[PDB]
Amino acid sequence: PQEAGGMSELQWEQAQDYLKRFYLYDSETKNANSLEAKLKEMQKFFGLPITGMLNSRVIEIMQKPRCGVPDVAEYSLFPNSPKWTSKVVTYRIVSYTRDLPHITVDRLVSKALNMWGKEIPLHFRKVVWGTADIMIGFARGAHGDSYPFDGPGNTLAHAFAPGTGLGGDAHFDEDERWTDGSSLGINFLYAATHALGHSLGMGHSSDPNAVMYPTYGNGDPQNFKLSQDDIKGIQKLYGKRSNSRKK
Ligand SMILES: [Ca+2]
Ligand SMILES: [Ca+2]
Ligand SMILES: [Zn+2]
Ligand SMILES: [Zn+2]
């Protein structure tokens, strides 16, 4: 909490490790000098300009929630594919949270997922009989998977990469707050575009107006939608397109 930067080694480790979990679990790189190199990468990935340092904006974000998905791969059980390679993608809800009835959760995922679908030539299909590729469920890290519950705050939602039928699923930290009309904690619409975006193998982006922006913050937009730099990125791989925007 601000002083994390100049805290004792034990508390300080939490800061260094908070970035580390958001990337991967590699005990080799754990080091006090190596710290400085890896931070360089955090700053480009995040976008923030201040670099080689941490305490003010860098920490402000570690403590602030964002996402629970790693951003890299190394010694783990996952396939190698940048995006979905299936002919069609599908999605179904497993369970629902008391904050929102089942229909509401469901229509939010479609209202976000579809929004991605329109920005790409992939073909998406609605579910009415049987299981689907992407399962959307509420659960805690102790449901039977890696990534722990870590309580509310830090770590917002883990999700999986488009891998096989089982992999590709999306999840929501049930501990976290979830709503839409109340507009109090995390809007489902907003996180859904992010969580579902990770089910497409999209990586984060640095623009401050990005949809996967890892620096959660910004004001309260009117309707809100896919961003410019985020769209061109996915298009460059599914086809060919370019663009530029800042602020
Ligand atoms: Ca959490
Ligand atoms: Ca899946
Ligand atoms: Zn993310
Ligand atoms: Zn899980």
Curated annotation (Swiss-Prot):
Binding site for Ca(2+) 2: 150-151, 153, 155, 173, 176
Major subcellular site: secreted
Keyword Signal belongs to the record: yes
Top-level taxonomic group: Eukaryota
Pfam families (alphabetical): Peptidase_M10 (PF00413), PG_binding_1 (PF01471)
Reaction catalysis annotation: Cleavage of 14-Ala-|-Leu-15 and 16-Tyr-|-Leu-17 in B chain of insulin. No action on collagen types I, II, IV, V. Cleaves gelatin chain alpha2(I) > alpha1(I)
Subcellular localization, as worded in the UniProt entry: Secreted, Extracellular space, Extracellular matrix
Gene3D superfamilies membership: Collagenase (Catalytic Domain) (3.40.390.10)
Protein name, as recorded: Matrilysin
UniProt source species: Homo sapiens (Human)
Lineage: Eukaryota, Metazoa, Chordata, Craniata, Vertebrata
